[PDB]
Design a protein around this ligand. Structure first.
Ligand SMILES: [Ca+2]
Ligand SMILES: [Ca+2]
Ligand SMILES: [Sm+3]
Ligand SMILES: [Sm+3]
Ligand SMILES: [Sm+3]
Ligand SMILES: [Sm+3]
Ligand SMILES: [Sm+3]
Ligand SMILES: [Sm+3]
Length: 182
């Protein structure tokens, strides 16, 4: 019943729109946010499509499902990803813009170079499957990085990168030191 914490940074590589059309924002700070659901759903679709080369246990067990029939609980809890303090300070001091509005309709985007702190929590529901689940999480990441988040994907927008990923057992004594994403 251990929990493993995956934390790191999501960096924007090309303008990010998650919804004339403003980007979604934290109510508390009015700063852009990447919702966990955005991340969850995109990683699920992508990893499903990957394996599909009728659901797959491996996708189900990490992400769960809201769909008919399913009872399987998600091992992987995905937080909202928040505008990093490092980003706020740097952009403030150097008069850098963290959003910009362009014509396609009028579209707000999070600027290249903005970074968000992210956090996944992994529940060890079945000790024998941790290694495989962690390979699959990694694969999901890589697929998201060779794809896109939110809108404007096909015109090259919404490219993000994961980096500085730290793995740590925050509940229980499960030995997670061998685990690595990248
Ligand atoms: Ca570690
Ligand atoms: Ca610990
Ligand atoms: Sm389905
Ligand atoms: Sm095996
Ligand atoms: Sm590996
Ligand atoms: Sm990459
Ligand atoms: Sm991809
Ligand atoms: Sm990376």
């Amino acid at each position: 019943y251990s929990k493993i914490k995956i934390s790191g940074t999501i960096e924007v590589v090309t303008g990010l729109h998650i919804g004339d059309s403003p980007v979604v924002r934290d109510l508390q700070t009015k700063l852009p946010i990447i919702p966990g659901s955005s991340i969850k759903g995109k990683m699920r679709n992508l990893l499903a499509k990957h394996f599909g080369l009728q659901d797959d246990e491996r996708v189900l067990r990490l992400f769960g499902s809201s769909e008919k029939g399913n009872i399987q609980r998600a091992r992987l809890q995905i937080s909202d990803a928040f505008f990093s303090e490092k980003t706020k300070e740097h952009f403030a001091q150097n008069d850098i813009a963290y959003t910009e509005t362009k014509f396609e309709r009028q579209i707000e985007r999070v600027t290249r170079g903005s970074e968000f702190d992210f956090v996944f929590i992994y529940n060890v529901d079945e000790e024998s499957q941790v290694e495989d689940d962690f390979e699959n999480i990694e694969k999901a990441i890589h697929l998201l990085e060779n794809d896109y988040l939110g809108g404007g994907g096909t015109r090259g927008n919404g490219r993000i990168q994961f980096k500085d990923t730290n793995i740590e057992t925050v509940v229980g004594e499960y030995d997670s030191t061998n685990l690595k994403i990248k």
